[PDB]
Design a protein around this nucleic acid. Sequence first.
RNA 1: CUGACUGGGGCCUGUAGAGCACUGAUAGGGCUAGGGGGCCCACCAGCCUACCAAACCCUGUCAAACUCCGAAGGGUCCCAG
RNA 2: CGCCUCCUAAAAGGUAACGGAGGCGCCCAAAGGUCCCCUCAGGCGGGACGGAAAUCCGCCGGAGAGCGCAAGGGUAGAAGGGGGCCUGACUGCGAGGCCUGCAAGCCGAGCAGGGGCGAAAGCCGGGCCUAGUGAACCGGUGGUCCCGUGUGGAAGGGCCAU
RNA 3: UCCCCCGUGCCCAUAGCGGCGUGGAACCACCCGUUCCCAUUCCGAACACGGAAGUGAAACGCGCCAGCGCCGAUGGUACUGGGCGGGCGACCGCCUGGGAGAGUAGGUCGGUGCGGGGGA
Lengths: 53, 77, 141, 110, 45, 181
Amino acid sequence: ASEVRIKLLLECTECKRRNYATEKNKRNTPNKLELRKYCPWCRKHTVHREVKI
Amino acid sequence: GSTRNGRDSQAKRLGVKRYEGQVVRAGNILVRQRGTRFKPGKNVGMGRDFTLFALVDGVVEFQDRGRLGRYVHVRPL
Amino acid sequence: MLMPRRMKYRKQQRGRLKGATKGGDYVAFGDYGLVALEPAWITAQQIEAARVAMVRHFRRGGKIFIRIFPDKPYTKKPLEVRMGKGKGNVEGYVAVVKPGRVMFEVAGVTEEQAMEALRIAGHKLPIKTKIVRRDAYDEAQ
Amino acid sequence: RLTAYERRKFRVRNRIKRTGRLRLSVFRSLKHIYAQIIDDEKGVTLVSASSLALKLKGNKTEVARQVGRALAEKALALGIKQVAFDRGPYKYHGRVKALAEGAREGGLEF
Amino acid sequence: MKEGIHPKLVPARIICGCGNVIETYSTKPEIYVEVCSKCHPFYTG
Amino acid sequence: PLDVALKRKYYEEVRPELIRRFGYQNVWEVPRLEKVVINQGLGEAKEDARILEKAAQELALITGQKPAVTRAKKSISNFKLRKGMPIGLRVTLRRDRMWIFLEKLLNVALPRIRDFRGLNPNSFDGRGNYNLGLREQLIFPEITYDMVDALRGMDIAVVTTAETDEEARALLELLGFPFRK
RNA sequence: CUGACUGGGGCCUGUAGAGCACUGAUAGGGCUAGGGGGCCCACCAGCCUACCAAACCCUGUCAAACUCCGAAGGGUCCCAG
RNA sequence: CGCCUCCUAAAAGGUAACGGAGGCGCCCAAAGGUCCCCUCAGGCGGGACGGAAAUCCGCCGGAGAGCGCAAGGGUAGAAGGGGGCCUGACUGCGAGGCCUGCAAGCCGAGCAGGGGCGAAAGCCGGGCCUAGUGAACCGGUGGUCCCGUGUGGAAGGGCCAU
RNA sequence: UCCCCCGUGCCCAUAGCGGCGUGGAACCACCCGUUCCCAUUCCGAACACGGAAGUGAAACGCGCCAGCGCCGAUGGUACUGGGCGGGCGACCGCCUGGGAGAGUAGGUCGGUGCGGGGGA
Ligand SMILES: [Mg+2]
Ligand SMILES: [Mg+2]
Ligand SMILES: [Mg+2]
Ligand SMILES: [Mg+2]
Ligand SMILES: [Mg+2]
Ligand SMILES: [Mg+2]
Ligand SMILES: [Mg+2]
Ligand SMILES: [Mg+2]
Ligand SMILES: [Mg+2]
Ligand SMILES: [Mg+2]
Ligand SMILES: [Mg+2]
Ligand SMILES: [Mg+2]
Ligand SMILES: [Mg+2]
Ligand SMILES: [Mg+2]
Ligand SMILES: [Mg+2]
Ligand SMILES: [Mg+2]
Ligand SMILES: [Mg+2]
Ligand SMILES: [Mg+2]
Ligand SMILES: [Mg+2]
Ligand SMILES: [Mg+2]
Ligand SMILES: [Mg+2]
Ligand SMILES: [Mg+2]
Ligand SMILES: [Mg+2]
Ligand SMILES: [Mg+2]
Ligand SMILES: [Mg+2]
Ligand SMILES: [Mg+2]
Ligand SMILES: [Mg+2]
Ligand SMILES: [Mg+2]
Ligand SMILES: [Mg+2]
Ligand SMILES: [Mg+2]
Ligand SMILES: [Mg+2]
Ligand SMILES: [Mg+2]
Ligand SMILES: [Mg+2]
Ligand SMILES: [Mg+2]
Ligand SMILES: [Mg+2]
Ligand SMILES: [Mg+2]
Ligand SMILES: [Mg+2]
Ligand SMILES: [Mg+2]
Ligand SMILES: [Mg+2]
Ligand SMILES: [Mg+2]
Ligand SMILES: [Mg+2]
Ligand SMILES: [Mg+2]
Ligand SMILES: [Mg+2]
Ligand SMILES: [Mg+2]
Ligand SMILES: [Mg+2]
Ligand SMILES: [Mg+2]
Ligand SMILES: [Mg+2]
Ligand SMILES: [Mg+2]
Ligand SMILES: [Mg+2]
Ligand SMILES: [Mg+2]
Ligand SMILES: [Mg+2]
Ligand SMILES: [Mg+2]
Ligand SMILES: [Mg+2]
Ligand SMILES: [Mg+2]
Ligand SMILES: [Mg+2]
Ligand SMILES: [Mg+2]
Ligand SMILES: [Mg+2]
Ligand SMILES: [Mg+2]
Ligand SMILES: [Mg+2]
Ligand SMILES: [Mg+2]
Ligand SMILES: [Mg+2]
Ligand SMILES: [Mg+2]
Ligand SMILES: [Mg+2]
Ligand SMILES: [Mg+2]
Ligand SMILES: [Mg+2]
Ligand SMILES: [Mg+2]
Ligand SMILES: [Mg+2]
Ligand SMILES: [Mg+2]
Ligand SMILES: [Mg+2]
Ligand SMILES: [Mg+2]
Ligand SMILES: [Mg+2]
Ligand SMILES: [Mg+2]
Ligand SMILES: [Mg+2]
Ligand SMILES: [Mg+2]
Ligand SMILES: [Mg+2]
Ligand SMILES: [Mg+2]
Ligand SMILES: [Mg+2]
Ligand SMILES: [Mg+2]
Ligand SMILES: [Mg+2]
Ligand SMILES: [Mg+2]
Ligand SMILES: [Mg+2]
Ligand SMILES: [Mg+2]
Ligand SMILES: [Mg+2]
Ligand SMILES: [Mg+2]
Ligand SMILES: [Mg+2]
Ligand SMILES: [Mg+2]
Ligand SMILES: [Mg+2]
Ligand SMILES: [Mg+2]
Ligand SMILES: [Mg+2]
Ligand SMILES: [Mg+2]
Ligand SMILES: [Zn+2]
Ligand SMILES: [Zn+2]
């Protein structure tokens, strides 16, 4: 990692909880990562948000 | 009077764990390899690190097909 | 002298001088041959003497040939320093010669000078040698 | 030295070899069509069907459906149910899609 | 060809300065050129 | 396929004369024209003028088709070049637009050549084929002095089924290639 | 009875040794980009290299980190002792 | 001084020296999963500028190409290059083995939920692989709603992921 | 159960390159065309689709050619598991077990397993 390649938390949008954490390069991807992922709290697929760790 | 050399890694135990004729089981690693020196045949898989393994109970088999390479198989019983 | 202007790596390990010669046992170039009879490490400076001191016999004319090369570097630590602290430093490149190897060959000169010129070269080596005429056994290969 | 034909057919066959299902060999010529399902593990062609033998006449696109019904009917007589469809080196479309529909509509589970 | 992204070809009349009528198929039907092979010095001997 | 002057003149004028002279034993035995590829070697488009489409549409009007992109093979030092850089263009010419571009080239382009001294008979591919190149596109009919923004040329390569460069030479001379030697 | 040891079959190997097809290294030669030198010209070329030499060709040598080849062994499984 | 690659290292696996050589502490939103398609380096002929070598054609051309980065192994019958749809850079697990003194690191079919793509067969628990790492202790953050010193809350912990 | 073609595998050049010669009734290929489905980082070259006038030229199939390539004995040797002598040593020998590499003769211009439709 680096100050640019940062790890962050992935927050499921419909359960208000964070389920994951991955890598992204803020120079190549400064946008907020929003990607599908499974949420056991909702028991179904949900789109996930980029939230600061 | 120093030595800029003197650095090394540890060996990874590369080779054939079960030779042809040995008793194997599902999950028993067959050959630890880097790259494709051996290629999988019947009931033999390949891992991300190129390691091979048997899928069923049977007998190990080594059959060299020349330009296709050496192949490993498992004989059910 | 004779030494590589480019190599892959700097130093080479010593190895072992066991066994007979790989090849070059048959006269391949000239009318007469000088073949060393003992295994040892030979230096390109001694071989340099074998070239210069031998052209100094004819003073002009003739043709002298070379059958070997110093492809093996030789290293030595500085003086008055202890063991360890890396391998020694190279002071020159040495040649690997095995028993029965035809080291040199002479052509374009008479029999008398073919024996006499290779004689001094025989005395310039730590190992004994022999002068053999290009023989019917040689060209068969 | 090989060609893109070899490099292509070899690939679409190497993928089908590893699955284990029955492999339907598809060789296509200018005039007629040919189809055969083979078990390569024991290395013997079991059954085959072709438009040249079936004496078909017109458009190849609708010709493939009939030969698919023929091969699928023979396999239905033998009791064959599941099969993997090899598309050969050619692009999967049109006539090969309608022959594949011949085997699908013929009852084979794929 | 690729329809839509390529220049379409139609019967084209190309009239040179010498008078030789050129019946061809170009991007522009009506074309006028200044010098052709019929009036070219090196082409004509 | 739309019939054209060079097409008719080959089968009715060029084909019978080749049949007489060389006496071919089959109809496919006679030399056939395979394909005519065009390579615009702009190059300088890597530099200040990054886009060469202003010269690409030129070939779109000349050949009637848009030339493809050709990207660099690997990073190259002295040309200030890197891998995958579009410094050239390429367009393949075939069934009918090839005959069209042939009539335009021979009848309009080759005449307009500045101080034309003739063709070089030694530039054959050796297998019965030929390649060449042009300096100024104003020579072609489809290009005038109005819309030309910069100076650029081309490299026209052709392929043939003929085997001997002698048969190829008689083919070109019979089709109207004015060799100077 | 499975143990050390060994017999019969099966499988794994890249060193001794050998070898130059790959990576390097090489002496001489042929051939030949190419420079240097002497002629021949600033106006351009044609001419010759008892010259260092690319590539390729011939001959002969080098290797722990070179391997087109290659054991004895060693390894390990399977019956009997 | 931890880690990776090659040699010694004596053809299984393992083997030290202040020995002979080099590299890692990053980087990737596609360089990932699926599906379809493509085939080099180099050499020979021609070709604006145009080049030893930019870009194309022809003919010869099993890998010397390129696979982020050292190096090895591997590989064009791809894992390598051009585009499409995509999130399996999954949740809950896990037969058995590898490695092995412990802790540990590596492989992994397969079953269930929920999903991507293909016509299908199938394939997807990140990357061609081996380096790109940190054990306990402490606290935070977000959730969980397990505990609550009579009791009902609450404080603070616990669990989970981080 | 015999011969010619075309699908699909095996061994993985004894099978390749290279040239000599040839195959179209069936059959495949190139071929005939591009409205149409499909298609070129351009091109109906490829990819794809509808057809049947022409052709074995190319490719492919099948013969020959040992030029190159490929495979390559035997005989000896290198080397070595294991048992010994010598040399101040760099190292050298014989006893028994294994046995190369290369190289010399010589061999190969394939053989083979099923499914189709044709021929005796
Ligand atoms: Mg940091
Ligand atoms: Mg940093
Ligand atoms: Mg900083
Ligand atoms: Mg900071
Ligand atoms: Mg000091
Ligand atoms: Mg250093
Ligand atoms: Mg260490
Ligand atoms: Mg360790
Ligand atoms: Mg065990
Ligand atoms: Mg076997
Ligand atoms: Mg075998
Ligand atoms: Mg072999
Ligand atoms: Mg040694
Ligand atoms: Mg040695
Ligand atoms: Mg020898
Ligand atoms: Mg000192
Ligand atoms: Mg001192
Ligand atoms: Mg004499
Ligand atoms: Mg005498
Ligand atoms: Mg005499
Ligand atoms: Mg000889
Ligand atoms: Mg500039
Ligand atoms: Mg720049
Ligand atoms: Mg750049
Ligand atoms: Mg027992
Ligand atoms: Mg024990
Ligand atoms: Mg033991
Ligand atoms: Mg035996
Ligand atoms: Mg190794
Ligand atoms: Mg050695
Ligand atoms: Mg050689
Ligand atoms: Mg290598
Ligand atoms: Mg010269
Ligand atoms: Mg000359
Ligand atoms: Mg010279
Ligand atoms: Mg040679
Ligand atoms: Mg051999
Ligand atoms: Mg044991
Ligand atoms: Mg063990
Ligand atoms: Mg047992
Ligand atoms: Mg240390
Ligand atoms: Mg450690
Ligand atoms: Mg080892
Ligand atoms: Mg151990
Ligand atoms: Mg032990
Ligand atoms: Mg110590
Ligand atoms: Mg370093
Ligand atoms: Mg050539
Ligand atoms: Mg310049
Ligand atoms: Mg190869
Ligand atoms: Mg091959
Ligand atoms: Mg290979
Ligand atoms: Mg090369
Ligand atoms: Mg690399
Ligand atoms: Mg390799
Ligand atoms: Mg969970
Ligand atoms: Mg169980
Ligand atoms: Mg165990
Ligand atoms: Mg471990
Ligand atoms: Mg233990
Ligand atoms: Mg909290
Ligand atoms: Mg409450
Ligand atoms: Mg709380
Ligand atoms: Mg807390
Ligand atoms: Mg019968
Ligand atoms: Mg009968
Ligand atoms: Mg066949
Ligand atoms: Mg082969
Ligand atoms: Mg053949
Ligand atoms: Mg010849
Ligand atoms: Mg003859
Ligand atoms: Mg002849
Ligand atoms: Mg008839
Ligand atoms: Mg073509
Ligand atoms: Mg085709
Ligand atoms: Mg129609
Ligand atoms: Mg016969
Ligand atoms: Mg001859
Ligand atoms: Mg023993
Ligand atoms: Mg004795
Ligand atoms: Mg005694
Ligand atoms: Mg002793
Ligand atoms: Mg003594
Ligand atoms: Mg002593
Ligand atoms: Mg003796
Ligand atoms: Mg024994
Ligand atoms: Mg043949
Ligand atoms: Mg042949
Ligand atoms: Mg019959
Ligand atoms: Mg008959
Ligand atoms: Zn959710
Ligand atoms: Zn005119």
